[PDB]
């Protein structure tokens, strides 16, 4: 396990296969002993017992394997998960008393049996299974932080160095999704026990990365991972961080600090929020209804006010209108302290958006973009006003 986590196994596929064989033989001998003598039990089942530490190294290395940028290793790791579940069952009546997340490991076997049409589908299935991992066992906690350390170190290498690293970029993209989907266990443990906070803090810096080495691909991958891959339990932290990130663009009087980086962050945040709300994650409702999207949406609207009339500004306004419609479609999922004033505010702010340059434009492209923006704004306004009583602010 130390050799494998060291990540110098040039023949890691065969090593994993033989490790599967060794685990199978270990479980077979354990079953033979248990049939011979029920109680092994006092040598690893209750310095801590050496068998417990060995199993911890086993699960840490197995969690590393799912992140390995290869393709055949995922099946090896899932078979090893199935064998670990089998040996946990043999040693034992609830099997969750030893491995609380045994359901996810059992689902790993069904995931492994089904044919994968490339690494991308297998990678997505691994992210989904990690999202399904609820109980924060010690193996996940050790593996997640250790994998994060490798991810953090490889993060600097791509950026700091000013090619052949396409494989490294793919591995880092896999690491991002791995940490996003498996990050829920660490945060849940920290709630009843932070490095989890620094994960998004580095992530927050990611969307505005401008590096000479294919920064556009990095931004696209980061946005896609943050949107689709992120676990539901990490939602409140994402909302809290994004609110304060957006709140730094306005002065004390409320003057917007208009900057290219600020606009890029705003348009990344809009795209990511649209992707997040559009996707119906399993159990996301019970977690999205804790933080509020009120202040951040309001600030984004205030910033988009001064976006101007350029093509980029029109596209940003259309995307924001689509986001407003999508968010309004899920009022039940979200929790609002004061929905009435919120909806009135956006209705009053969006009323100005419609019919902006429907006559003063001199080009069809300007006219087409204006018509698209007007249609999107009208759709958003119609969505807002369904059931919206009118109550003007203090007059």
From Swiss-Prot:
Substitution effect: residue 83 to R: In mismatch repair deficient cancer cells
Source organism, top-level taxon: Eukaryota
Protein's recorded name: Neurofibromin truncated
Organism: Homo sapiens (Human)
Upper taxonomic lineage: Eukaryota, Metazoa, Chordata, Craniata, Vertebrata
Gene of this entry: NF1
First-to-last residue of the parent protein present: 582 to 1090 of 2839
């Amino acid at each position: 396990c130390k050799k494998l986590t060291s990540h110098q196994m040039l023949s890691s596929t065969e090593i994993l296969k033989w490790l599967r064989e060794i685990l199978i033989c270990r479980n077979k001998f354990l079953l033979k002993n248990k049939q011979a003598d029920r109680s092994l039990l006092f040598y690893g089942v209750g310095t801590p017992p050496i068998c417990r530490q060995a199993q911890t190294k086993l699960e840490v290395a197995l969690y590393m394997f799912l992140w390995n940028p290869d393709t055949e290793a995922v099946l090896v790791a899932m078979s090893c998960f199935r064998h670990l579940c089998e040996e946990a069952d043999i040693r034992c009546v609830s099997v969750h008393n030893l491995l609380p997340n045994y359901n996810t490991f059992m689902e790993f076997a069904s995931v492994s049996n089904m044919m994968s049409t490339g690494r991308a589908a297998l990678q997505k299935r691994v992210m989904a299974l990690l999202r399904r991992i609820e109980h924060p066992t010690a193996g996940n906690t050790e593996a997640w932080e250790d994998t994060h350390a490798k991810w953090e170190q490889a993060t600097k290498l791509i950026l700091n160095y000013p090619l052949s690293d396409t494989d490294s970029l793919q591995e880092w993209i896999n690491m991002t999704g791995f940490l996003c989907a498996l990050g829920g266990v660490c945060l849940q443990q920290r709630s009843n026990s932070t490095p989890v906070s620094k994960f998004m803090d580095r992530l927050l810096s990611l969307m505005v990365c401008n590096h000479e080495k294919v920064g556009l691909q990095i931004r696209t991958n980061v946005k896609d991972l943050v949107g689709l891959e992120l676990s539901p339990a990490l939602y409140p932290m994402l909302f809290n961080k994004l609110k304060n990130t957006i709140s730094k663009f306005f002065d004390s009087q409320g003057q917007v600090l208009l900057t290219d980086t600020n606009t890029q962050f705003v348009e990344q945040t809009i795209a990511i929020m649209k992707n997040l709300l559009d996707n119906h994650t399993e159990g996301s409702s019970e977690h999205l209804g804790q933080a509020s999207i009120e202040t951040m949406m309001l600030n984004l609207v205030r910033y988009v006010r001064v976006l101007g009339n350029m093509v980029h500004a029109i596209q940003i306004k259309t995307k924001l209108c689509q986001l407003v419609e999508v968010m309004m479609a899920r009022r039940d999922d979200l929790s609002f302290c004061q929905e009435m004033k919120f909806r009135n505010k956006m209705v009053e702010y969006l009323t100005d958006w419609v019919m902006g340059t429907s006559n003063q434009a001199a080009d069809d492209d300007v006219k087409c973009l204006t018509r698209d923006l007007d249609q999107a704004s009208m759709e958003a306004v119609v969505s807002l006003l369904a059931g919206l009583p009118l109550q003007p602010e203090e007059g």
